[model samples]
Target: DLAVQEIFVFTPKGDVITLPTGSTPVDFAYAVHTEVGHRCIGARVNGRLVALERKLENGEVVEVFT
Candidate 1:
């Protein structure tokens, strides 16, 4: 549930990002940088490709594509 507390996720490079537990990759992209968020079109989670609307999970490594 979105109302759940925030969670921490990691970048492929091991950078930590805190987000709402139900946050999407779109949120992650923006966390990286505003311009990054604007250019992001998709993502790769833990080596598998995913969509911007993809819901992130705790401790998952997210690799965003601009």
Candidate 2:
């Protein structure tokens, strides 16, 4: 399998964002909605807590609940 390499994101503007590998939640959030990027509290990478600045990989489902 290809490991489902895809980026996930949640924006303050009520928009979910997606990106390729090597992307960060900050980037994703910003792409989706700038306000969410500023209010980003934390991120969940593959169901684990990660820093907001953490780099994203392929197929990682990121959930930004803030």
Candidate 3:
């Protein structure tokens, strides 16, 4: 089997999705919807503010503010 590391991120609606490790909030934004990425101005991980370029971690809740 191919070994792979992954992370889980939550959308604003509380939907959980798997993503590759090193993925960032911007990455998650694009995964949710194209408009989400276009509208994304900033983000919060686990209720805390973080830069979009900050690599996401496992089980982090992401909220991309439009």
Candidate 4:
């Protein structure tokens, strides 16, 4: 089984990014590549569309398509 962890990220804008379980669109974007983070438009969690600033959950794979 997979476990969830909490982490913090400081955006280029100096915004502290924090999520509940998994990484949000912004998190994933930043993790994948910097360009992706800049080009991030939206995100989906568990096949449900959520706000870009929404919190992600455990076992959820975030998909970010800019």
Which candidate leads in TM-score?
1
Every model's TM-score = 0.83, 0.56, 0.77, 0.56
**Against the true structure, what is every candidate's RMSD?**
2.6, 6.2, 2.0, 9.7
Kindly list the per-residue Cα lDDT of model 1 for residues 1-66, writing each as its tens digit: 346577989998778999876888888988896876888888888999998888997898987778
> Order the candidates by lDDT, highest first — what do you get?
1, 3, 2, 4
What alpha-carbon RMSD in Å does predicted model 3 have with respect to the real structure? 2.0
How high is the lDDT of residue 47 in model 3? 84
Q: How do all the candidates rank in terms of TM-score, highest first?
A: 1, 3, 4, 2
Cα lDDT of model 2 by residue, 1-66, tens digit: 676667554443455567766787777665655776778888777678888888865445665544
Mind giving the per-residue lDDT tens digits that candidate 4 earns over 3-65?
Answer: 666655443334454564645677677665677677888877667787788766544555565
* Candidate 1 vs 2: which has more lDDT: 1
- Please estimate how well model 2 matches the true structure, expressed as its whole-model Cα lDDT: 0.66
Which stretches of candidate 2 lie above 4 Å from their native place? 1-21
Better of 2 and 3 by TM-score: 3
Q: Regarding TM-score, does 3 or 4 come out ahead?
A: 3
- At residue 2, what lDDT does model 4 achieve? 75
**Highest-lDDT candidate:** 1
Clashes of 1: 0
Residue pairs of candidate 2 with colliding backbone atoms: 4-59, 5-58, 5-59, 6-59
| Pairs of colliding residues, candidate 1 | none
| lDDT of residue 10 for candidate 4 | 45
